[PDB]
Design a protein around this ligand. Structure first.
Ligand SMILES: CC(C)(COP(=O)(O)OP(=O)(O)OC[C@H]1O[C@@H](n2cnc3c(N)ncnc32)[C@H](O)[C@@H]1OP(=O)(O)O)[C@@H](O)C(=O)NCCC(=O)NCCS
Ligand SMILES: *OP(=O)(O)OC[C@H]1O[C@@H](n2cnc3c(N)ncnc32)[C@H](O)[C@@H]1O
Length: 637
């Protein structure tokens, strides 16, 4: 247990008693609690209904603030203009540190308005899906906000996805438009964004895209399709900076984020507007102990939910200054992240255990020549962090001075679910601690039996909360089954957790067939499909193994078609194939050639034995037992 330091106790918005009181009321009386708390936002017509939800088998229905209207872009921009139009909305720090920007709330609003008009003239309407495939530049934020302003439904696709991965997301969403850049810049290198868009758009199944809008970021020689492709600058220049925001209904679709699951290819997790935004703003405020003037930096990419809720929307709803870094925390040197912290006097740092671990491998080289005094609060997100990395982060980055908020949540939860509050809750290294306001966690065994006291089990949430995802795009039925059918009447996270005697949660990772690689969520089944689509592969089974930096790496067991033969050229080819099917994020670290997949009566494949072997272990009965011996020997090279 870490004590709350006196400087936080002196300023904190939520103290221990406040946490207890607000939490109790959020459970007992959600309508009063969230009816009051919803006023963190401006509404165009005020809501009357607040909580109206059900996890009931075959009638899953989540509505928050339903009869109220609002606009997300006016809450994140317009309403800040009168008094704080000159406050920096976004600090942009380039890969190359000589390149930066302060974009005032005024400047940002003006651009969102011009870009809203641009989208509107191109024929984009409320409800249309817009695919955003952009590097970490401020224009990505401009694009996302402008979509929300006019009520279109943006789908941000992470820059590191391959053409094949982009196209799938375009097809499932029926995106009418792609917004991208000529190239992204990361670690001194160019990322071929627009070319990737070119290749994705040649897939014969893509039929919905009418235009691609291209940001001239590096000025690279790119292929151009006349009529389809439009320069960002040409368009926005011609567009009026005047735009009135129209009322959106609280339950109007805000965005889609494609997410990996246990089965199938990734599905489009859908968020609406009112509930999502209240929850984002609220969690941001209280968990980062945000005070006006605090310089806030979340390192996560715009392409992930953390990038949606804690890079842009939450921060901006609260009128914060938020920092968007173009590059990587360790380029040119491991000291970079902290150079960034010093250069912009960052007070809140929210980052990833993978990054932390990579910085930790380099020890003091991660802090040499840097000061870090400006920091008051740290956060960790996206995967479990073990005590030792938590301790090193607390100590070297926070100089033993900063509460670390380890925030547990998911794309499907919209915002933080189980998390410390810096002035309310004493910290245990590696523990996400206590549920947030509105959040009712429980642990169950594999049969759904609730586990009481200090115990472990399958982590579920037993009631709704304002930021909850509302559906899977085009597939509400799959939403019911993926999340509300294992444990009837309950939200099943896919995670396992331990609860200790204080009621602190310790998230131990996914209990379904989902991997966490560098803090990226990936389905084993989707990697196997990508392997089997190779004309030389017959079958594959993919597991996670522990990895010092990355958390888990991908260890693929691969059965070649009859006749074929392993070579070192084949190893690289198959890695490059997975990379083109999905992307670098999903490249297997190890290929284990085998004719010895362990199967049952029916072809069902034995995953537990495959896991342990890959971990490098030696300690049930299948359909042919002598393959466990073969699979061990094979593992010794
Ligand atoms: C530690 C970290 C900075 C290291 O990234 P890295 O050094 O670039 O290596 P990664 O494992 O991330 O990725 C490897 C490859 O993907 C590429 N890649 C990663 N992010 C990319 C992006 N934003 N755009 C294009 N390519 C990208 C890298 O350039 C590299 O390319 P290469 O294989 O051709 O050499 C990073 O992976 C990380 O901290 N991720 C955490 C995720 C997170 O914040 N989770 C919360 C979101 S919900
Ligand atoms: O891609 P995604 O955001 O939906 O992934 C969410 C999953 O990632 C893991 N996760 C996220 N945050 C944490 C923390 N703070 N501790 C442990 N694991 C974490 C989970 O597996 C979650 O389901």
């Amino acid at each position: 247990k870490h004590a709350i330091p006196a400087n936080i106790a002196d300023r904190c918005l939520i103290n221990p008693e406040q946490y207890e009181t607000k939490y109790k009321q959020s459970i007992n009386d959600p309508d009063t609690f969230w009816g009051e708390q919803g006023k963190i936002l401006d509404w165009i017509t005020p809501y009357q209904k607040v909580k109206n939800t059900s996890f009931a088998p075959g009638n899953v229905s989540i509505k928050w603030y339903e009869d109220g209207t609002l606009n997300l872009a006016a809450n994140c921009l317009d309403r800040h203009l009168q008094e704080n139009g000159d406050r920096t909305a976004i600090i942009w720090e380039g890969d190359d540190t000589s390149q930066s920007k302060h974009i005032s709330y005024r400047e940002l609003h003006r651009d969102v308005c011009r870009f809203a008009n641009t989208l509107l003239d191109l024929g984009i309407k409320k409800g249309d899906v817009v695919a955003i495939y952009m590097p970490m530049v401020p224009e990505a934020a401009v694009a996302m906000l402008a979509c929300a302003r006019i009520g279109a439904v943006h789908s941000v696709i992470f820059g590191g996805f391959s053409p094949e991965a982009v196209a799938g997301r375009i097809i499932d969403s029926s995106s009418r438009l792609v917004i991208t850049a000529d190239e992204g810049v990361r670690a001194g290198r160019s990322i071929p964004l627009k070319k990737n868009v070119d290749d994705a758009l040649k897939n014969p199944n893509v039929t919905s895209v009418e235009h691609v809008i291209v940001l001239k970021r590096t000025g690279s020689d790119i292929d151009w399709q006349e009529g389809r492709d439009l320069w960002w600058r040409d368009l926005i220049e011609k567009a009026s900076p005047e735009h009135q925001p129209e009322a959106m209904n609280a339950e109007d679709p805000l965005f889609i984020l494609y997410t990996s699951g246990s089965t199938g290819k990734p599905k489009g997790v859908l968020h609406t507007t009112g509930g999502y935004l209240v929850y984002a703003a609220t969690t941001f405020k209280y968990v980062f102990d945000y005070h006006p003037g605090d310089i806030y930096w979340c390192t996560a990419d715009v392409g992930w939910v953390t990038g949606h809720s804690y890079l842009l929307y939450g921060p901006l709803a609260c009128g914060a200054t938020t920092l968007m870094f173009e590059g990587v925390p360790n380029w040119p040197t491991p000291a970079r992240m902290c150079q960034v912290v010093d250069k912009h006097q960052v007070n809140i740092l929210y980052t990833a255990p993978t990054a932390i671990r990579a910085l930790m491998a380099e020890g003091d080289k991660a802090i040499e020549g840097t000061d870090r005094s400006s920091l008051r609060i740290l956060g960790s997100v996206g995967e479990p962090i073990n005590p030792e990395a938590w301790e090193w982060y607390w100590k070297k980055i926070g100089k033993e001075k900063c509460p670390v908020v380890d925030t547990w949540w998911q794309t499907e939860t919209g915002g933080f679910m189980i998390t410390p509050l810096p002035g309310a809750i004493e910290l245990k290294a590696g523990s996400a601690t206590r549920p947030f306001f509105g959040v009712q966690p429980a642990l169950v065994d594999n049969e759904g039996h609730p586990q009481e006291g200090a115990t472990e089990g399958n982590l579920v949430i037993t009631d709704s909360w304002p930021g909850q995802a509302r559906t899977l795009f085009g597939d509400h039925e799959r939403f019911e089954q993926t999340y509300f059918s294992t444990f009837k009447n309950m939200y099943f996270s896919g995670d396992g957790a331990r609860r200790d005697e204080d009621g602190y949660y310790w998230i131990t990772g996914r209990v379904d067939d989902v991997l966490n690689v560098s803090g990226h969520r990936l389905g084993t089944a989707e990697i196997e499909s990508a392997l089997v689509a190779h004309p030389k592969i017959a079958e594959a089974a993919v597991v996670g193994i522990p990895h010092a930096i990355k958390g888990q790496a991908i260890y693929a067991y691969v059965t070649l078609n009859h006749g074929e033969e392993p070579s070192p050229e084949l190893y690289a080819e198959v890695r490059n194939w997975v990379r083109k099917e999905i992307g670098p994020l999903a490249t297997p670290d190890v290929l284990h050639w085998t004719d010895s997949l362990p199967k049952t009566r029916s072809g069902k494949i034995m995953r537990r034995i495959l896991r342990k072997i890959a971990a490098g272990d030696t300690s049930s009965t299948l359909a042919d037992p002598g393959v466990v011996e073969k699979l061990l020997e094979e593992k010794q090279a």
